[PDB]
Amino acid sequence: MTSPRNCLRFTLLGCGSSPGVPRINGDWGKCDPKNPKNRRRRASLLVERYDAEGNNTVVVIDTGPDFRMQMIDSGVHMLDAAVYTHPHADHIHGIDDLRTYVVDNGRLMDVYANRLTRNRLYDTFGYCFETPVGSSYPPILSMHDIAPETPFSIEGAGGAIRFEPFSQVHGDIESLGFRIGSVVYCTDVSAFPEQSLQYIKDADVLIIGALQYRPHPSHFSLGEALEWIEKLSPKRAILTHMHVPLDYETVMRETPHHVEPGYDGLRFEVAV
Amino acid sequence: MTSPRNCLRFTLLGCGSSPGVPRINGDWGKCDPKNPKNRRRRASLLVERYDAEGNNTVVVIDTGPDFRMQMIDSGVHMLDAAVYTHPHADHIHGIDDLRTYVVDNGRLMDVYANRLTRNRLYDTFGYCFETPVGSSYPPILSMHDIAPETPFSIEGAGGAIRFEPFSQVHGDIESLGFRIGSVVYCTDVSAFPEQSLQYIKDADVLIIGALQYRPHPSHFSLGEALEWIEKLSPKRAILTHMHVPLDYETVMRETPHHVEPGYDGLRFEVAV
Ligand SMILES: Nc1ncnc2c1ncn2[C@@H]1O[C@H](COP(=O)(O)O)[C@@H](O)[C@H]1O
Ligand SMILES: Nc1ncnc2c1ncn2[C@@H]1O[C@H](COP(=O)(O)O)[C@@H](O)[C@H]1O
Ligand SMILES: [K+]
Ligand SMILES: [K+]
Ligand SMILES: [Mn+2]
Ligand SMILES: [Mn+2]
Ligand SMILES: [Mn+2]
Ligand SMILES: [Mn+2]
Secondary structure (H helix, E strand, O other): OOOOOOEEEEEEEEOEOOOOEOOOOOOOOOOOOOOHHHOEOEOEEEEEEEOOOOOEEEEEEOOOOOHHHHHHHHOOOOOOEEEOOOOOHHHHOOHHHHHHHHHHHOOOEEEEEOHHHHHHHHHHOHHHOOOOOOOOOOOOEEEEEOOOOOOEEEOOOOOOEEEEEEEEEEOOEEEEEEEEOOEEEEOOOOEOOHHHHHHHOOOOEEEEEOOOOOOOOOOOOHHHHHHHHHHHOOOEEEEEOEOOOOOHHHHHHHOOOOEEEOOOOOEEEEOO | OOOOOOEEEEEEEEOEOOOOEOOOOOOOOOOOOOOHHHOEOEOEEEEEEEOOOOOEEEEEEOOOOOHHHHHHHHOOOOOOEEEOOOOOHHHHOOHHHHHHHHHHHOOOEEEEEOHHHHHHHHHHOHHHOOOOOOOOOOOOEEEEEOOOOOOEEEOOOOOOEEEEEEEEEEOOEEEEEEEEOOEEEEOOOOEOOHHHHHHHOOOOEEEEEOOOOOOOOOOOOHHHHHHHHHHHOOOEEEEEOEOOOOOHHHHHHHOOOOEEEOOOOOEEEEOO
């Protein structure tokens, strides 16, 4: 058997900070421009469940500006739902590209967001939900609420994928993290509230944001992320949302064996 | 002399329709997937003026979702201004990526838009103009009005670039086209008003949208674009905003010698 079966499969679609690596002006920072692993798209995760016959349920976490190229390069040509962490540009400005799937599926695309995120999507992308005055474009999205500490499930051809959302502090706003089975996704986080600890401890894989070496008001530094990894004892940790000071080979050396920097297209399967 | 001097230089950053080619679901339509010229980013044009010493003024027309990769691949690492045609997703959803230049230039990025476009950018990207409640992010953009039949000039290190905007019908809304010297850029157009004809006739290069073979309410078909090219007698025409029915090699054969389909990265210099 040479295709995925009886598993969850995770693909790190993007592992960069908000301006990407390099920045738009060609700035690679301290990254080796010759290592393709240092070319970073904006942060996003693809989550799939495969059954015994290889049928799949497919869910994306965040639709940033790189969403179209991320999906094309993933090789996965269908989508059941999108789930959002928070309403920052690098996580939402690719939303229009969900249109194609609406035509393929013959129904509105199910999207999942908390109230803060939803209310900002309605402000800035209202035409995706309701046809405005002077337009003939039908809406393309169907909104579902999510909230910390309330699990939700997304159905599809591979069976249901159950998400456990939890609260994160992200500078001056809240973002969501998610546990999916044994795998935890924590991007855009500067502190973990006490009530969220149960969701983040004892993960088989912890995917955790580490922006740079120096402190930043909205994200963990590398040292802060490593302190959390030591406390939470994941079997493996993968760093994400990495900015131009963090070079792949350098960070690989500086971190424990069970910890690695992410790279775009990083893919693994786990039991379900 | 092996770098540009004493010229205008134009780069077709993107030549695709709104979902790109291929679509996000991997659909190439009738395009040969093996020809790299058929991989199309969303429509945008880079305009540069170089002086005798190779100093440049750099202006982008539209900042769609592909804007960051377009600029990186262009090799041009600075920007003086952005000019907008109309407020559709494929032309504006990359706007946040102007942030990097604001830091480099030490001043807000000058953006140019008509009232319709400006009012939609304020709705959907207000935080780029004014810090909202609960935020510490400074604004990044400085807005300037443009209107059909009123020329405007953008200053920079290579000298001024003079734009002549004009009205286009684009289905149920108006879009702007621009003449820059001898070069005319007409994307997202389904009809030309009589008063715009003076700007589009007798171009050295006419860059004109041709979506597909079949009629569409918002864009010229290939046949309609060719009818206009015959009436307007440009020396050379380049087709843009091309959707998945239009294969590069096929359209090259079907069109007169002085007419060609565009491709991403297409670049030419003209006298100033
Ligand atoms: N009010 C806002 N709405 C959406 N995006 C914002 C807002 N304010 C700032 N941003 C952008 O959100 C991103 C913040 O990046 P991060 O450091 O990854 O939390 C940057 O792309 C900012 O330019
Ligand atoms: N009210 C709106 N604001 C912004 N973009 C829109 C709106 N309505 C539709 N669109 C998108 O704008 C694009 C229209 O594409 P075009 O066929 O190139 O004119 C598509 O990406 C649409 O999903
Ligand atoms: K390591
Ligand atoms: K031809
Ligand atoms: Mn972010
Ligand atoms: Mn953020
Ligand atoms: Mn368009
Ligand atoms: Mn349009």
